[PDB]
Symmetry: D2
Subunit: 115 residues, 4 copies
């Protein structure tokens, strides 16, 4: 599993559970092709999105549905979602972990890429 | 200015200067219509993007072109850009300041929304 | 002002108002001597802490009293405070702006350092 | 292990390895008593700092030696270190994970507290 997502709730100090995540791949016509998706687990994680075979070089977009998450908690949020757009490059480490720390009016994301 | 952007460079401890920013507004067909664009100043600030009159209700996307910024500094960063997508002015006119703090493999964005 | 602090509330999307800030400077015995204090304004800003003359070389600690801030909003936060410790003016006088973005279980701080 | 630390390098997009971490406990006389310490692993983690028996309620300080980390990489940093000060409370979740994302002139820290 070369692509992982770890989402944290900076308000409650807990993993962000049941957050919808959609991954897209940029197509030849510059549109976003659905690639993979899921809901974060009780540990705020989402793995098994793709395989080494399928995760070829290219531009990918990871959309985290933060708005629905905050609405479920009864908290008015700012963003429609958090977007993480990046290029997968074979000439570097294999495993991509996208960290995302969520607050109603702020989010931070950090990519950790390793072997 | 109802729409403002403040960008900081967390590697150099300075405002992020000459960063290109493109703003889009969602149309009916889910496509992103260009709304406004500019580049950050020496203070990492970008005002004069729009006016209260033109900045109507809608879903807006503020795209900060961080990749170019880092490459010019000799750094190969992770993200293509930093995207900030939000509904604006749905409860009346508001003033928005989008803060962004950039690192090659990380960014944070915080929105300050005030009622004039 | 050579020392400035800008604090934002990432839960409400606003400046963090009336946040107490204490600045200390390290002495010889590793103890923290009180240097200056204040509270953030409506803009989440705090200037007038010190002067160029008084702000000599040294190791400074900017302590932001976030716990009190969150408790007053009905939130029980994780941190006692947000501490920002740094060497200042060791290469001559500089201007420092300490940005802080607060959430109940998280905070970020970014320093902008400029040469006047 | 009720206390864990996960440190990430936001410049290189990798765990922050070999970062010294010192944990202190606030004593009756308001001074900081050394409690535990170590160096982050190849995964930027530091566990086995303490036990449930020893990790009683009280105020703790986690000092991350970020200055030495950046100096090793030949990068001039701003902070002397990153400090995370908090109260351990029995009336909540047991495991504390302190996340820290490091940049030369910025750091973010997020606490994740779970069962």
């Amino acid at each position: 599993c070369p692509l992982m997502v770890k989402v944290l709730d900076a308000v409650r100090g807990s993993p962000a559970i049941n957050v919808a995540v959609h991954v897209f791949r940029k197509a030849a016509d510059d549109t976003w092709e659905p690639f993979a998706s899921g809901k974060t687990s009780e540990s705020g994680e989402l793995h098994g999105l793709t395989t080494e075979e399928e995760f070829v070089e290219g531009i990918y977009k990871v959309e985290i549905d933060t708005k629905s998450y905050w609405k479920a908690l009864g908290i008015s949020p700012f963003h429609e979602h958090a977007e993480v757009v990046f290029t997968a490059n074979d000439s570097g480490p294999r495993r991509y972990t996208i960290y995302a720390e969520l607050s109603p009016y702020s989010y931070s994301t950090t990519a950790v890429v390793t072997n």
